[PDB]
């Protein structure tokens, strides 16, 4: 009993032949694919440059997390497309590559809903992490699910769940001749993902 349910008067026993065989010598040694190996992997989101011309509190990359994860490119599209509702947690990577002759810093804040008004200088209240050329090039942020309904709706979502923001925390500076930029990358994955609501209508 799964979903498709036959109700019949005349039915009959099925005719098997053989049965499931285990492999004494495996063809492929990797784990058999499933949800936990598909949905939960790391995916790439936004890739931009961080330049010295960005003033203080300029916004390098403004991202909408869930809207970006849903695309034909990423194999997690497989599940989400045929399911109407979902709820889930998110994890985030932010990786940059400073050369130690540079100096500066960034902030990566996960804000639920939208920033709206509230102060920029307070973004250390939201779950966050700080990039600095002195210490570390990587941050990990993990947030549970926050929303004003029971679950998210992919076809016509009410408002974006987690809209990530990145502000320049201190102006970038270099000496004479030093490389004037650095790459910037963002990674995200769903966690403990739960689906409901199968449907054809997505096609």
């Amino acid at each position: 009993a799964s979903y498709f349910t036959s109700v019949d008067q005349s039915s009959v026993h099925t005719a098997e032949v053989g049965s499931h065989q285990i492999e004494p010598l495996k063809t492929s040694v990797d784990k058999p694919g499933s949800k936990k190996t598909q949905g939960e992997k790391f995916f790439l989101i936004h890739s931009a440059r961080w330049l010295t011309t960005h003033a203080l509190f300029h916004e390098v990359a403004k991202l909408d997390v869930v809207k970006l994860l849903y695309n034909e490119q990423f194999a997690v599209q497989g599940l989400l497309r045929y399911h109407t509702y979902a709820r889930f947690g998110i994890e985030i990577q932010v990786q940059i590559n400073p050369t130690p002759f540079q100096q500066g810093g960034l902030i990566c804040a996960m804000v639920p809903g939208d920033q709206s008004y509230g102060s920029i200088a307070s973004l250390t209240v939201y779950p966050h992490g700080l990039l600095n050329c002195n210490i570390n090039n990587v941050v990990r942020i993990k947030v549970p699910f926050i929303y004003t309904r029971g679950a998210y709706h992919f076809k016509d979502p009410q408002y974006p769940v987690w809209e990530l923001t990145i502000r320049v925390w201190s102006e970038l500076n270099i000496g004479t001749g030093t490389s004037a930029y650095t790459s910037l990358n963002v990674l995200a994955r769903f966690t403990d993902l739960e689906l409901h609501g199968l449907t054809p209508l997505s096609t």
Binding site: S119, L130, T148, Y159
Partner: protein, 224 residues
């Protein structure tokens, strides 16, 4: 030793900072604390005010937690500040309204959940609703001669898990409304003596608050 730390590493961010030699600063001298939310917002705060210019006109206002709506229509002063510190809200509210001016005025106030057919918000017009439709949703009928003030608890009835104060566009028009309170006046016959109302909102002990946000930049907070 606690005078040096790496704040770029959140594990060491929970360290207890020490700098100079210190002593324990005794006690607080007054018993109650004022930093518990259920006390500070235990005090009531201002909400809105309106006046009736003619007899048999009905008035309606929603309680909207949105930041976008600017006073005089919206949340003023403290509430506008308080409902933007945190992301979500749920649970009943304690409403107190105060009557002034003219006397011998019957009135019937009701509460309308979000989304149901109701008068247009922030508009003073003759009631469009069937008298049979009003009392079904429940109402209190008050006279201004005897009391002139009413303290009543708004219930939590909504199809949402909770309501939010920070929203934009398509969401902010729907989720951000708590409910509608309406007041109809009758027997106002003389147009003189200037009947006027005022509301005051308070927070209960059954309310909750979730996921602290960032406070509002000063250009946001306003007054009527």
């Amino acid at each position: 030793v606690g005078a040096i730390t790496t704040i770029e590493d959140p594990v060491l961010a929970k360290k207890v900072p020490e700098t100079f030699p210190e002593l324990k600063p005794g006690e607080s001298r007054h018993t109650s604390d004022h930093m518990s939310i259920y006390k500070f917002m235990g005090r009531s705060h201002f909400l809105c005010t309106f006046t009736f210019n003619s007899n048999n006109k009905e008035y309606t206002f929603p309680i909207t937690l949105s930041s976008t709506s600017n006073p005089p229509h919206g949340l003023p002063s403290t509430l506008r500040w308080f409902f933007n510190l945190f992301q979500l809200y749920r649970g009943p509210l304690d409403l107190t309204i105060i009557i002034t001016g003219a006397t011998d005025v019957d009135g019937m106030a009701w509460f309308t959940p979000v989304g149901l057919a109701v008068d247009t918000p922030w508009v003073e017009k003759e009631s469009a609703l069937q008298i049979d439709y009003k009392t079904a949703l429940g109402a209190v009928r008050f006279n201004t001669r005897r009391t002139g003030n009413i303290q009543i608890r708004l219930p939590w009835y909504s199809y949402l898990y909770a309501v939010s104060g920070a929203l934009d566009g398509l969401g902010d028009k729907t989720d951000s409304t708590f409910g509608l309170v309406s007041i109809q006046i009758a027997n106002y016959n003389h147009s003189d003596e200037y009947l006027s109302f005022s509301c005051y909102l308070s927070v209960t002990e059954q309310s909750e608050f979730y996921f602290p946000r960032a406070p509002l930049n000063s250009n946001a907070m306003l007054s009527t």
